[PDB]
Design a binder for this molecule. Structure first.
Ligand SMILES: Cc1ncc(C[n+]2c([C@](O)(CO)[C@@H](O)[C@H](O)[C@H](O)COP(=O)(O)O)sc(CCOP(=O)(O)OP(=O)(O)O)c2C)c(N)n1
Ligand SMILES: Cc1ncc(C[n+]2c([C@](O)(CO)[C@@H](O)[C@H](O)[C@H](O)COP(=O)(O)O)sc(CCOP(=O)(O)OP(=O)(O)O)c2C)c(N)n1
Ligand SMILES: [Ca+2]
Ligand SMILES: [Ca+2]
Ligand code: NA
Ligand code: NA
Lengths: 620, 620
């Protein structure tokens, strides 16, 4: 469709719109007593032109799948986002004045309780990665005409995650993606490093494969023109702006970031801005081409039961890849992402079978998580991203923000614990249960054999929120029948007798060590009950307690994880105060070191012999 | 000092050295049965030239403060690092064959139990940030002649953290820093994105402010020459290499990352490499100029007691800045780092008083943590880095690796919990206690007033490991006398009576809410004991239990944090099984939202009224 070259009246209306957006940003933040009007004002022309000339969207249906996407990466400019959606007719204008109130959903930074927000922002440097996922989805999955626009701050460009996204977009030729850089010179507490050295921003963008255009970010005409030309590459509109533009005496000054105008000043400034507005008549949004496809919403089911055999040996990391590939044959919604570890996590199996739905994210875990979040928006795909669980610590802020974004993503982290052996602690996940348990929307699966792994993959696919699956390197025996029923929050008793003296809770390699301990102890005429949690969060408190009551109240937890935040603490917190119940923990007490898997389980006190000794100690 | 232009014999000796390093890397990884010989072999000439022509260091004293630093950012090339230190005469050559054994310290990736390792690597993309801290320290603090060399992989350059470090080095004019990029074309599971497009690497480095030189990374002469010219900017030596260089049939091939050669193949290949070596005679290291200054090692003491007054109001975030500035007058070892939040964390106070020892790190928390780790190496400084606690989640992998690095850094995270109010959840730290408690070397301080904050700063300065101080936004009353003695692991009972019915444990704003609850309850003739942990890790289990035993066994924890991994779980895990002890928790159950601080404490069930109701419930 042809560019509509605006006449002077349309240009003036865009200026009038920009100034209305300034006024609202000031009014709202002065009413609240907090917020970031100067960060809004540098972006006012950008916002006016995007929403009232360039973008195509249904103003009354912001989540519509055919719409262009807008991502406010500099989320503290929320008041101007709210203002455009009022200008577009979706929000009531009076509601803007309720910014930041407990009685409003116009919160301090954008959040998905707002129909016009897909991802929460507020932690800087994450929006472009989400936008890349949206754009990748648009070009390669939806195969639709929508475009994706992401507005970033200049201080924000100091985040490495932004540059991961830049690189991703050029690798994947996201010519439906536009990044708008609000180069307003200043950060929060000092000038941004490059200030108004526009040429250096251009060189950095070009070196990362983008088409880069420097503009006057306060010229509505230059913005219309620059946004009106599609390219064959991701495009960076590098906008020279002034922080607090239009606020006389504040424009281009330090000491104003995140400071509202006092009421007396707001009144005077608003009168001046209003004097520049030529007409009250608002521009209307223009609707999109409706070419996004339908997506099915039904539950996704494995095409058959697991086909393992009891006694066969397989590492849960390999079972994950097998199960994910299997699930991919059941539904085209499943996509897989991995950060140059596909041969070790076994997501390569999925790539072999379903290459068009695998996204290689390279060694950039922060961006990988953001891509997944973007791909999941508007329920367009069901993503499974994988790496070593240790390296999900590199993406914790993205995971944290994903929960604030109410995102439905699945994350599988392999190589947990000391049982990986020789690579040593840099590769050992020993804090991932702590990390993922702290994510409020999380479900944490810790499958102990191949059957449980396949069931965890299936359950995760159909579970909302942040699903984490912890996989392991050692080959361990299949212990479950492949028709064993598995559910979130339901544990399994895998060994019992009427004369059990301790309930031992293990998972993954420590479940198998507990079973080996039981065999050692039978020689001493000591029986133990062995319990496999299946999910660490939520925890089957009832079965744990019922088990403990059959074993003299005694629970022993054993885990290939640090003491804090893991299985032992979860269990302790669940049962504390219950009469006659005791909980004893075995876990890894310090940074480990290289050795064979069995040697490290021994050294760190979580193998069969440590378990047996702890049991004997409890009995006496 | 003049470049010594090598003769053909010295060049041949450097080639011979490179080939010896290949042989050792193969031998060691074949002996271990695991490791990354192909990743070693691409770097062999680089390593030979750095260690035996360019660098200046004491071969028998790798930690010597006058030495040039080398950082192996691509840590999986550990076997070649070990091999150079054997070649230099520090390690016994026989020991190289014990790679990855539980009986050896030649672990899978480098770790600081090795004298020649300052920081652990293995999580890719972190070494350059550490190197930047070392170089900044060398140029601006030590004011010494040592240089810093950091070897990176090409896949590794996909990490955003690398680009943060690139930008930092040019901002701070680190002309004593050299990054060597091993552009061997291949990552772990596919070619690296840019493969051998050397010009694009050059453009990216130049756009980020570095002097960039493309070389044949297998030419010892080109390497000598390129390393021999100092510059006025940080310098990137962009080395075109082949993965598995020198291994016939493996060089430049996929499917070989992290795969050792089988013994039959290793023998054949080693014979071929050995046939290329002209002389067995080894080159000797050359020693450094000894111009690094002495650094004092004594305990650092505040110059006077805190000067607060009981009843005065101050936010602990502001007390942190005051206390840090105060401590800076006591010792020149203290340095402060912050990520464009100095006005909000109050580290700006330190910057005002001690500007030469403040490092602005901009909006790049991952790199900030790495800079701090680098600055702490060899005990050259005592760093305190600050941001909002929420944004330390962006740096969790750096923090995790800092503990593996046995680093002594101090981290202060502000803006904890819902009590910040209107900014909303993106800015609210609700998982930081979980995160930092899971770090094995951590001490977690949660000061509840200005006095406790100043004491926490002082204690942290003198405590090894990863020290975290959690600060808060609300002004709360000073409750402690300024001569109150504080110690790690020692809690305080701040309200008691003989007829106390519940021990209520709070911290920060919830300690003050608990005190307000006690006042509400006295009206009902209910007294509660109130306990302030001071440190969450380690936890004063004895005082908690002694308190509980005076209050009918009943403990109530209340925290401005999520349920998992926080104060409630720490307490529960400490006391579980103790006869007659019960623990009830109040915490934040889901992602919050914007409102006034008091409104959010109410909504999320952690204010004075929630506490009072929970207490009444326990009594009945
Ligand atoms: C990952 C990360 N790191 C730092 C920040 C902090 N930050 C931000 C906030 O947290 C807001 O999201 C703070 O402003 C915050 O609201 C106030 O400090 C609270 O003040 P107080 O009254 O509580 O004292 S914004 C910011 C500077 C961004 O500079 P830019 O140049 O990117 O954007 P702009 O010039 O505004 O267009 C910076 C640096 C962030 N949001 N995300
Ligand atoms: C933050 C981060 N992300 C991914 C990695 C993984 N990674 C690594 C390791 O974890 C080693 O540190 C793995 O190799 C690991 O040892 C094996 O996967 C274990 O195999 P398995 O036998 O257990 O199956 S190395 C690596 C590729 C690095 O490619 P580069 O091009 O940077 O270096 P190079 O070509 O080797 O000079 C990549 C991608 C990392 N170390 N750090
Ligand atoms: Ca800015
Ligand atoms: Ca490589
Ligand atoms: Na899911
Ligand atoms: Na310390």
């Amino acid at each position: 469709e042809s560019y509509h070259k605006p006449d002077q009246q349309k240009l003036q209306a865009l200026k009038d719109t920009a100034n209305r957006l300034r006024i609202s940003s000031i009014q709202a933040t002065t009413a609240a007593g907090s917020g970031h009007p100067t960060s809004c004002c540098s972006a006012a022309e950008i916002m006016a032109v995007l929403f009232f000339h360039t973008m195509r969207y249904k103003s009354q249906d912001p989540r519509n799948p055919h719409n262009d996407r807008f991502v406010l990466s500099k989320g503290h400019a929320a008041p101007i986002l709210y203002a455009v959606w009022a200008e577009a007719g979706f929000l009531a204008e009076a509601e803007l004045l309720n910014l930041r109130k407990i009685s409003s959903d116009l919160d301090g930074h954008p959040v998905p309780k707002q129909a016009f927000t897909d991802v929460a922002t507020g932690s800087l440097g994450q929006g472009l990665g989400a936008a890349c996922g949206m754009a990748y989805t648009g070009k390669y999955f939806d195969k639709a005409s929508y475009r994706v626009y992401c507005l970033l701050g200049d201080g924000e460009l100091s985040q490495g995650s932004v540059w991961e996204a830049m690189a991703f977009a050029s690798i994947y030729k996201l010519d439906n993606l536009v990044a708008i850089l609000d180069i307003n010179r200043l950060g929060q507490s000092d000038p941004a490093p490059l200030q108004h050295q526009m040429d250096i921003y251009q060189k950095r963008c070009e070196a990362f494969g983008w088409h880069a255009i420097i503009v006057d970010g306060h010229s509505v005409e230059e913005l219309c023109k620059a946004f009106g030309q599609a390219k064959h590459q991701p495009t960076a509109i590098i906008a020279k702006t002034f922080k607090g533009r239009g606020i006389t005496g504040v424009e281009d000054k330090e000491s104003w970031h995140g400071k509202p105008l006092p009421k007396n000043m707001a009144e005077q400034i608003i009168q001046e801005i209003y004097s520049q507005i030529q007409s009250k008549k608002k521009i209307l949004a223009t609707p999109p081409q409706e070419d996004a496809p339908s997506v099915d919403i039904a539950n996704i089911r494995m095409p058959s039961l697991p086909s393992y055999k009891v006694g066969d040996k397989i590492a849960t990391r390999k079972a994950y890849g097998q199960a994910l590939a299997k699930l991919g044959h059941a539904s085209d919604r499943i996509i897989a992402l991995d950060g140059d570890t596909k041969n070790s996590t076994f997501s390569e199996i999925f790539k072999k079978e379903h290459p068009d739905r695998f996204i290689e994210c390279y060694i950039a875990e922060q961006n990988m998580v953001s891509i997944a979040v973007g791909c999941a928006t508007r329920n367009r795909t069901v993503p499974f991203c994988s790496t070593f669980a240790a390296f999900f610590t590199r993406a914790f802020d993205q995971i944290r923000m994903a929960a604030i974004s109410e995102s439905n993503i699945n994350l599988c982290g392999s190589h947990c614990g000391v049982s990986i052996g020789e690579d040593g602690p840099s590769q050992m996940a020993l804090e991932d249960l702590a990390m993922f348990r702290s994510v409020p929307t999380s479900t944490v699966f810790y499958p102990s054999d191949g059957v449980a792994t396949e069931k965890a993959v299936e359950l995760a696919a159909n579970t909302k929120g942040i699903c984490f699956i912890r996989t392991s390197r050692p080959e361990n025996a299949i212990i479950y029948n492949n028709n064993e029923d598995f559910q979130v929050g339901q544990a399994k008793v895998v060994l019992k007798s009427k004369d059990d003296q301790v309930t031992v809770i293990g998972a993954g390699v420590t479940l198998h060590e507990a079973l080996a301990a039981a065999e050692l102890l039978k020689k001493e005429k000591i029986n133990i009950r062995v319990l496999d949690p299946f999910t660490i969060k939520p925890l089957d408190r009832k079965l744990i307690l019922d088990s403990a009551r059959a074993t003299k109240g005694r629970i022993l937890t054993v885990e290939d994880h640090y003491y804090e935040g893991g299985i032992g603490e979860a269990v302790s917190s669940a049962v504390v105060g219950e009469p006659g119940i005791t909980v004893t923990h075995l876990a890894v007490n310090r940074v480990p070191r290289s050795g064979k898997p069995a040697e490290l389980l021994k050294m760190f006190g979580i193998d069969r012999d440590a378990i047996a000794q702890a049991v004997r100690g409890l009995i006496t």
